[PDB]
Design a protein around this ligand. Structure first.
Ligand SMILES: C=CC[C@@H]1/C=C(\C)C[C@H](C)C[C@H](OC)[C@H]2O[C@@](O)(C(=O)C(=O)N3CCCC[C@H]3C(=O)O[C@H](/C(C)=C/[C@@H]3CC[C@@H](O)[C@H](OC)C3)[C@H](C)[C@@H](O)CC1=O)[C@H](C)C[C@@H]2OC
Ligand SMILES: C=CC[C@@H]1/C=C(\C)C[C@H](C)C[C@H](OC)[C@H]2O[C@@](O)(C(=O)C(=O)N3CCCC[C@H]3C(=O)O[C@H](/C(C)=C/[C@@H]3CC[C@@H](O)[C@H](OC)C3)[C@H](C)[C@@H](O)CC1=O)[C@H](C)C[C@@H]2OC
Lengths: 107, 107
């Protein structure tokens, strides 16, 4: 599934609802910390909506547990990410992924 | 994983090697037989290579067990396909997929 470990607390009040746009900054890394992607490096937040199969399930269920302003590490098992296939040229088969996610706002 | 059940036998001699192009016709369906895609409908075989994360793992391991001319049903568990996420707008979360695959040739 997904484990959510908090780096900095959110407002403890505003949690994402299906049909809102979540605006986040993320860094994705393998379990040993190797970075494969980050929106912080592009200086451009990533936006997505819950309920539309727009993100891997680990994100759909991890970000729904965060409130605005929170920064958390989401550790996602392979079945909630790219499974036995991986993602071509970036993520190996059976990889647990770690995302450092900051939920900046909801629109 | 993947289960391979044969509809028509292949030559029992020529099995796909990494670095060959497999030329196939396929029909993909959910477990109840609902069709979501077929190359047969486009009259255009699908081609791919083993060893390059070009296909879901269930195909990488299922087609490697088929010889040329064989037609088989590959039943693939979600972790060897799209897992808990599914494929946006086409495949639901946690879906076992069934592919009717004919291995036409290797190039
Ligand atoms: C339409 C095509 C381009 C479109 C691309 C963008 C909007 C740019 C957006 C910043 C993606 C990044 O581009 C630099 C890059 O992000 C990664 O590096 C990454 O960190 C990651 O894992 N992310 C991104 C952050 C949200 C979680 C997760 C995701 O959910 O990503 C989603 C993902 C790949 C889901 C697949 C969908 C197919 C399902 O079958 C499968 O289910 C198993 C899961 C992305 C958002 C797709 O919905 C949308 C796209 O693909 C991937 C390693 C590869 C991906 O490039 C493609
Ligand atoms: C570059 C972009 C376009 C590029 C599209 C084509 C060459 C056209 C090709 C006929 C695809 C079909 O287009 C009508 C259509 O085929 C399906 O309908 C389908 O029957 C299927 O399941 N197939 C196709 C037959 C081989 C097995 C499997 C697959 O392995 O498909 C692969 C797949 C989606 C793998 C993801 C890759 C990301 C990993 O993270 C994830 O790992 C969990 C698995 C396809 C071949 C990709 O490698 C290449 C592409 O995407 C999918 C339901 C959705 C897919 O449309 C996209």
């Amino acid at each position: 599934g997904v484990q959510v470990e908090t780096i900095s607390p959110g407002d403890g009040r505003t949690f994402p609802k299906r049909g809102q746009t979540c605006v986040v900054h993320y860094t994705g890394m393998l379990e040993d910390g190797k970075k494969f992607d980050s929106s912080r490096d592009r200086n451009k937040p990533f936006k997505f909506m819950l309920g539309k199969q727009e993100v891997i399930r680990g994100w759909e269920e991890g970000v729904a547990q965060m409130s605005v302003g929170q920064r958390a590490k989401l550790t996602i098992s392979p079945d909630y990410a790219y499974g036995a296939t991986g993602h071509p040229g970036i993520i190996p088969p059976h990889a647990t992924l770690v995302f450092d996610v900051e939920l900046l706002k909801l629109e």
